[PDB]
């Protein structure tokens, strides 16, 4: 469950730099405290400005719409147990904040990489004609059909309350 934030920051004005340059970044985080932490994390590494020498001008939460389905491409770098690697991933979602949740869960389940081990380089929306991965592509077509992937779950779920039954229920398909 992520949100998306726009954060503004600047180094405190000095005598030889009365009006320092301002920097803007886009952050996905579960709350604004984490958002500011990550902002300072990147500003220290890229611009040599620490939290102690700078100030945050504004952390504004932005809510998307979320009606149709879009294809998102995510470029990231993560550190494993043997160094660092780049990675491109494709996700299908209604919002960019919801796509980040899917990406993070997939990275946790498949690569064993946690939130603070990952750096999101860029997030963009991709057209149906320039999809790179086969799953998203096969779901972008028209008139796509398939049977229910796990109909046993409905029958299993109802047996938890009705412990003893007079016949074995069938699985409709």
In the complex, the residues that contact RNA under the rule CB under 7 A are 37, 40-41, 44-45, 48-53, 79, 81, 116-117
Question: Which residues, in sequence order, are CB contacts of 60 under 8 Å at separation 6+?
Answer: 5, 6
Nearer residue to RNA within complex by CB, 51 or 70: 51
The nearest distance, CB 110 to RNA, in angstroms, is: 15
Residue number with CB closer to RNA (77 or 154): 77
Instruction: Indicate the DSSP class of residue 34.
Output: H
Strand order in the sheet with 54-62: 22-29, 3-11, 54-62
Least separation in angstroms between CB 36 and RNA: 8
Q: Are 72 and 90 in contact (CB under 8 A)?
A: yes
CB nearer RNA, residue 119 or residue 140: 119
Q: CB of 71 within 8 A of CB of 140? A: yes
- Residue number with CB closer to RNA (35 or 131): 35
Q: How far is the CB of 39 from RNA (least distance, A)?
A: 10
User: Taking the alpha carbons of 91, 95, 97, 102 in that order, is the dihedral positive or negative?
Assistant: negative
In whole angstroms, the minimum distance from the beta carbon of 53 to RNA comes to 7
42 or 133: CB nearest RNA: 42
Distances (CA, A) of 170 to 155, 166, 167: 8, 13, 9
- Least separation, in Å, of the C-beta of 123 and RNA? 19
């Amino acid at each position: 469950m992520m949100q998306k934030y726009i954060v503004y920051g600047r180094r405190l004005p000095s005598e030889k730099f009365p009006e320092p340059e301002v920097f803007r970044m886009t952050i996905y985080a579960p709350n604004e405290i984490v958002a500011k932490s990550r902002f300072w994390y990147h500003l220290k590494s890229l611009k040599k400005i620490k939290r102690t020498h700078g100030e945050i001008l504004d952390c504004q939460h932005i809510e998307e719409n979320g009606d149709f389905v879009k294809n998102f491409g995510v470029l990231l770098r993560y550190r494993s147990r043997v160094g660092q690697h780049n990675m491109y991933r494709e996700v299908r979602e209604t919002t960019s904040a919801r796509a980040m949740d899917k990406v993070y869960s997939e990275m946790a389940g498949q690569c064993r990489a946690r939130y603070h081990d990952i750096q999101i380089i860029n997030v963009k929306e991709v057209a149906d004609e320039d999809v790179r991965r086969e799953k998203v592509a096969m779901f972008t077509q028209k008139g796509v059909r398939f049977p229910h992937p796990c109909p046993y779950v409905h029958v299993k779920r109802a047996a938890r309350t009705a412990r003893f039954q007079d016949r074995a229920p069938h699985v409709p398909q």
